[PDB]
């Protein structure tokens, strides 16, 4: 079975599955956990940075795309660099040509279409990384979940990566609460850090291990690492 239909992205299995895409999705599950959640005034990204040795640094997981948009990654870092770069350009194009800030919803559509092309043609390969996009545009705060299959969804909160299921259940429980944490960034963040620690197991979030990002009403997308995240541990 599978072995005969998983040679490339241009082959459908007898049950209508695309294995190369499913294998790419598996690289996400092997990636470190990251969480995202929003209220009506702010959107937050929380990520657990992974290190190789105790002599190495913890690889960044959050990338800024514009003053009002950013994302967190889980899976192949290089693919995240390619995709975030494409998004940086799309945000750029929107500002230069229409003097308009790119709608988060539109960014999701562009990402979906870019990923899709790599699941229907020969020679290419699907992107092997998951993305959580947050932003504040003309219709408020937003959170998107991007999958290499091309499926992009808008949520109040979510999580991807290994053991991501813990945080996801916690968020699906805390909903009514954090969704109302308006005009209070520090609270939304703590709400996110609590969600991520629901997927811990190995260790505990430290200072050079935690990474947070926020965007909102009067808050440009900014990234907090190290000492700057101490007050949340």
């Amino acid at each position: 079975f599978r072995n005969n239909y998983d040679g490339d992205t241009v082959t459908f299995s007898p049950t209508g599955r695309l294995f190369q895409v499913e294998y790419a999705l598996e690289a996400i599950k092997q990636g470190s956990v990251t969480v995202g959640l929003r209220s009506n005034t702010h959107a937050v990204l929380v990520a657990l940075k992974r290190n190789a040795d105790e002599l190495s640094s913890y690889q960044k997981k959050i990338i800024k795309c514009d003053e009002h948009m950013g994302l967190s990654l889980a899976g192949l870092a290089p693919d995240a660099r390619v995709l975030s770069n494409y998004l940086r350009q799309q945000c750029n194009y929107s500002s230069l040509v229409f003097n308009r800030k790119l709608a988060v919803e539109r960014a999701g559509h562009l990402l979906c279409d870019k990923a899709q092309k790599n699941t229907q043609s020969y020679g290419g390969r699907p992107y092997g990384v998951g993305l959580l996009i947050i932003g504040y545009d003309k219709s408020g705060a937003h959170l998107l979940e991007f999958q290499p299959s091309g499926n992009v969804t808008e949520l109040y909160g979510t999580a991807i990566g290994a053991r991501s299921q813990g945080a996801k259940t916690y968020l699906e429980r805390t909903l009514d609460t954090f969704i109302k944490i308006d005009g209070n960034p520090d609270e939304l963040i703590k709400a996110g850090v609590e969600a991520i620690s629901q997927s811990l197991r190995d260790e505990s979030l430290t200072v050079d291990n935690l990474s947070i990002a926020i965007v909102g009403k009067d808050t440009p997308f900014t990234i907090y690492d190290g000492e700057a995240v101490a007050k949340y541990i």
Binding site: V97, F98, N99, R100, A103, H109, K138, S139
Partner: protein, 233 residues
């Protein structure tokens, strides 16, 4: 590189306390031949913007097609197309300016002079100019071609600087514009008596007036003029 063939003359405009006014006659000239008379040179985009075009008419019609497409395109996968994500006057202007400058940079201009009039979503008045060279500028009053020489002087007696805007009513402004159109009909050999006038108010919305006519003209004093110097009868 080209040369204009069928052309539209002046486009005049100014801003008042609650919005902007723009007008242009309905003539399409062919050199000295006043060839076409049912030409509308004021292009409404949505209900918050009006684009007035002078210069080559074939290029004007092309710009018209471009604008209708911007509207269609903006409505795609956009559930907020008639609300928060509707086209803003500033987006429309930046787009045209971009196009105008790229075309002159390829030595193949759209032989026009354009004025984009409208009201932003936050109530701000929008008035900006762009021409075949890609040159852009804003002012309380704007006029192209002949109107730049004869209309701006009359319109600037009403609004000479920024602080004069809030002190100016729709009635005063429209009166000034209408008088300017009459003056242009007196001294511009490529003008028409019929014209269109549009008002974009942050409260009353868009008011598009068609088939206006220059009225209250003074010609009687002509009976007394005879000869060119010494002739008495």
């Amino acid at each position: 590189t080209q040369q204009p063939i069928v052309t539209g003359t002046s486009v005049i405009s100014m801003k008042y306390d609650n919005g902007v006014i723009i007008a242009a006659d309905n003539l399409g000239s062919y050199g000295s031949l006043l060839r076409f008379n049912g030409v509308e040179r004021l292009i409404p985009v949505g209900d918050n913007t009006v684009v007035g075009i002078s210069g080559d008419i074939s290029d004007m019609q092309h710009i018209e097609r471009l604008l209708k497409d911007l509207v269609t395109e903006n409505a795609y996968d956009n559930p907020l197309a008639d609300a928060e994500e509707a086209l803003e006057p500033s987006y429309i202007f930046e787009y045209l300016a971009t196009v105008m400058y790229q075309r002159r940079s390829k030595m193949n201009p759209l032989w026009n002079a354009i004025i984009v009039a409208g009201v932003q979503s936050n109530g701000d008045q929008f008035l900006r100019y762009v021409n075949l060279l890609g040159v852009t500028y804003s002012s309380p009053t704007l006029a192209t071609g002949f109107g730049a020489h004869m209309a701006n002087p009359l319109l600037r007696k009403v609004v000479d600087r920024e602080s004069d805007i809030p002190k100016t009513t729709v009635q005063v402004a429209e009166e000034a514009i209408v008088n300017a159109m009459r003056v242009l009909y007196y001294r511009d050999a490529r003008s028409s008596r019929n014209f269109s006038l549009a008002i974009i108010d942050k409260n009353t919305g868009l008011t598009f007036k068609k088939n206006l006519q220059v009225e209250n003209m003074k010609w009687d004093f002509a009976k007394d003029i005879k000869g060119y110097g010494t002739q008495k009868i």
